[PDB]
Amino acid sequence: MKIVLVLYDAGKHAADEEKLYGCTENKLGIANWLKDQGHELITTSDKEGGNSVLDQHIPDADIIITTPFHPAYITKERIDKAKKLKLVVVAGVGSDHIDLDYINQTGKKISVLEVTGSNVVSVAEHVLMTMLVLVRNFVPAHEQIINHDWEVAAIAKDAYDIEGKTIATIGAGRIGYRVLERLVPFNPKELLYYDYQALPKDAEEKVGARRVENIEELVAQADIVTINAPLHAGTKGLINKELLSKFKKGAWLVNTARGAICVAEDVAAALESGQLRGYGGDVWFPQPAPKDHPWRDMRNKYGAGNAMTPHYSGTTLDAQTRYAEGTKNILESFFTGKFDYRPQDIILLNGEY
Amino acid sequence: MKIVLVLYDAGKHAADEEKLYGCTENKLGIANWLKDQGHELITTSDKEGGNSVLDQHIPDADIIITTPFHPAYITKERIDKAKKLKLVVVAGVGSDHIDLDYINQTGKKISVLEVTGSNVVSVAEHVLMTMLVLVRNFVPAHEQIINHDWEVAAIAKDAYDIEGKTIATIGAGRIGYRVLERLVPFNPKELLYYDYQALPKDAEEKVGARRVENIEELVAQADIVTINAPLHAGTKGLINKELLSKFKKGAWLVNTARGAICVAEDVAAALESGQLRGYGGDVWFPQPAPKDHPWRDMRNKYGAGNAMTPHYSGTTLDAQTRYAEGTKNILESFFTGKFDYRPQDIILLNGEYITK
């Protein structure tokens, strides 16, 4: 079969690190396994334009493998042209870039899978890191050192402990719950969550979480808010100026979910005004972030309160190993005709939800 | 009585934040309380040199209050001139700037107290923070953003999860154990510790910790090493070229304990060479760090691996509130003549060590 694998070019960086599997140079570590199994692997980063390498191969591709860190858009037109397509895989977690609705509507027997669970610890760690970095005012502290300065009062005046803070998550799924688990031994005043379903009772008790039934009530009492919810009609543009006005004054906000859950200029205004003390996370809208994106240069009144990174939390080297292995497992379930997929990995099974 | 309070000057920063109690401008929140009781408070940052404000007032100071973040050196010489001194307080935790040996060995009736426990959570958080920042390669990632770049492969190639790593602490006292407690839900491969005495089995088991008998074998198997031990003859210059050569290749090292536990140039050399993937923490030797202290400019091969900050982890605003409250509590105990100190706060009681 023909497998088209779309990843970013890591350039020099691929040679620096063999465990950087998720790039065109290193091919998820599955290049030899695929050839041994008697298949043809096309690997490319060239995914935009009617003459892109991706589109050259779409018409007789049996399998397309994608990643949210360099996403091949599996569009209506591409689905039309992909005459042999049987399987789309996300080597990672996130299918925003795939027109699942259309695949389903067509009636074609196309399965779509992702490596569920492979991102979750990595993102949850990124949230804990970002909370600590914002709350303890690390960024301006490290900046002093490398700028050959030393003025402890300039840092201490906006540095706190996470202990004794009220921490709320919007969404308590796989990532949000693991964020709560990691917060327990930091002795927060309380952990709170808002979600469309309850945590099972024993899960709730394990982290001492209290469910709050609406979002305004949730954010109004929270020192720290973290977003761990899917992007849909209920969350798109959820963090806007109106809702930000109901946050505790001087709150810290972390978003590793999706950029579009926030209105970008409204978050920036809230940080500059002092409504927020800090904002951070690794997700942006649009993404990759343009140079002029307001979250790059936004700061609080002290010139800090920014802990933004590019979108990379889910592409640590440990996550990438899980993606590579999980991709191999999915491909094996497919090639053997067993279709013994992990149920949690399935997005569509031969076109069906 | 006369109280001499030695703190740093926060300047404009003190006005920005009324909760910044540990500076000369804000006086631990006790200035009016002392005034209302008829006491005289001298507050100064001027602590060096013979004509300093500190030395002007030492001869009839009843009480001297100090902080580790701007330490008044209560030397033998100063103690001998301090004819009315009865009480030395640390508005915080850390007493190396006080000559305890001289007080205890002479038998001078001088009590020395600190606010025990008030620093521990703050420093342990800073350790967790620093571990995450180094292991997940945060610094160059944030730098991309504010420099208007975006190149994920350049960060990812040296970014890991904390999960699945072997993590070792040198020292398992108050801070070290609280670090281990916070690491448990991060699902390390294993938690290890070296110390001069064992944790009790119960405490070991609560965090899944295994004791390793010597430091060389501890560090040899650790992806992450954190230093949480006092500075003494066993730990001075402990992290040197020889010991660093026994670290696991590409380890991450965190030190929020004391700067002199490391040999500075040896740590810089190990980072530059790849023996360490990263180093961070907030303690330095000398301290404050000179403009050209090697730990400011050191980097790993990728230009990262540096998570240094100035010494501030134990002077967050939450810690400062604990210091200020705790100092007032010690002064109340003294002024009333109750001397009902918290047992854990006593370093010396009228010159004597007391059972822990």
> Got the DSSP string for A295-349?
HHH---TTS--EEE--S-GGGSHHHHHHHHHHHHHHHHHHHTT-----GGGEEEB
Instruction: Based on the residue annotation, tell me whether B258 is a catalytic residue of this protein.
Output: yes
Chain B residue with minimum CA distance to A153: B10
> Cβ contact (<8 Å) for B310 and A150?
yes
Model resolution, angstroms: 1.8
Q: What are phi and psi of A277, to 5 degrees?
A: -90, -30
Residue A291 CA, distance from chain mean position: 21
Find out whether A121 and B274 touch, Cβ atoms under 8 Å: no
Instruction: Quote the CA–CA distance of A180 and A193 in Å, as a whole number.
Output: 9
CB pair distance less than 8 Å for A164 and B318: yes
Closest residue on chain B to A19 (Cα): B157
Closest-CA distance, B153 to chain A, in angstroms, reads 5
Which residues in chain B are contacts of A69 at CB distance < 8 A? 152
Q: Are B136 and A125 in contact (CB under 8 A)?
A: yes
User: CA dist B39 to A197, A200, B29, B335, Å?
Assistant: 60, 59, 15, 10
Which tokens hold the place of B308? 């240094």
Smallest CA–CA separation between A130 and chain B, in Å? 9
DSSP code of residue A58: G
| Chain A positions in Cβ-Cβ contact with residue B13 (cut-off 8 Å) | 151, 153-154, 156-157
Asked if A20 lies within 8 A of B153 by C-beta distance, the reply is yes
Active site residues of A: 119, 258, 287, 311
Identify residues after which chain B is interrupted (C–N over 2.5 A).
none
Q: Whose structure tokens read 């074998």?
A: B217
| B177 and B199 Cβ atoms separated by less than 8 Å | yes
Closest by Cβ to B308, choosing from A142, A153, A185: A142
- Residues from chain A that touch B121, judged by Cβ atoms under 8 A, are 161, 163, 187
Domains, chain A, with CATH or none = 1-118+316-353 (3.40.50.720), 119-315 (3.40.50.720)
Convert A154-210 into a string of H (helix), E (strand) and C (coil).
HHHCCCCCCCCCEEEEECCCHHHHHHHHHHHHHCCCEEEEECCCCCCHHHHHHHCEE
B154: left (phi over 0), alpha (psi -120 to 50) or beta: alpha
In chain B, residues with a C-beta closer than 8 Å to the C-beta of A164 are 318
**Closest Cα partner for A327 from A1, A56, A21, A17?**
A21
Distance CA A175, CA A123 (A): 7
- Taking the C-alpha atoms of residue A154 and residue A142, their distance in angstroms, rounded to an integer, is 12
Name the token pair of B281. 């923490």
Nearest residue of chain B to residue A206 (CA atoms): B185
A133 vs B138, B151, B282: nearest CB = B138
**Secondary structure letter of residue A287 according to DSSP:** S
The CA distance from B236 to B96, in Å, is 14
Of A23, A121, A288, Cβ closest to residue B153: A23
Asked whether the beta carbons of A139 and A159 are under 8 A apart, the reply is no
Locate A69 and state its tokens. 């860190």
A to B CB pairs, distance under 8 Å: 207
Facing residues of B74 across strands? B98
* CA of B142 vs chain A CAs: smallest distance (Å): 5
Does B17 contact A158 at a Cβ distance shorter than 8 Å? yes
Distances (CA, A) of B272 to A159, A317, B127, B158, B304: 31, 22, 22, 15, 10
Distance from CA of B71 to the nearest CA of A (A): 14
| Nearest one of A170, A146, A178 to A313, comparing CA atoms | A178
The residue behind tokens 């620096």 is A16
Contact A332, B175 (CB under 8 A): no
Residues of B in contact with A315 (CB under 8 A): 152, 156, 159
Residues of B whose CB is below 8 A from A148: 291-292, 296
Three-class HEC string of chain B: CEEEEECECCCHHHHHCCCCCCECCCHHHCHHHHHHCCCEEEEECCCCCCCCHHHHHHHHCCEEEECCCCCCCECHHHHHHCCCCCEEEECCCCCCCECHHHHHHHCCCCEEEECCCCCHHHHHHHHHHHHHHHHCCHHHHHHHHHCCCCCHHHHHCCCCCCCCCEEEEECCCHHHHHHHHHHHHHCCCEEEEECCCCCCHHHHHHHCEEECCCHHHHHHCCCEEEECCCCCCCCCCCECHHHHCCCCCCEEEEECCCHHHECHHHHHHHHHHCCEEEEEECCCCCCCCCCCCHHHHCCCCCCCCEEECCCCHHHCHHHHHHHHHHHHHHHHHHHCCCCCCCHHHEEEECCECCCC
Please enumerate, by residue number, every residue of A annotated as part of a binding site. Answer: 93, 119, 174-175, 195, 230-234, 256, 282, 311-314
What is the rounded distance in angstroms from the CA atom of residue A156 to the CA atom of residue B92? 14
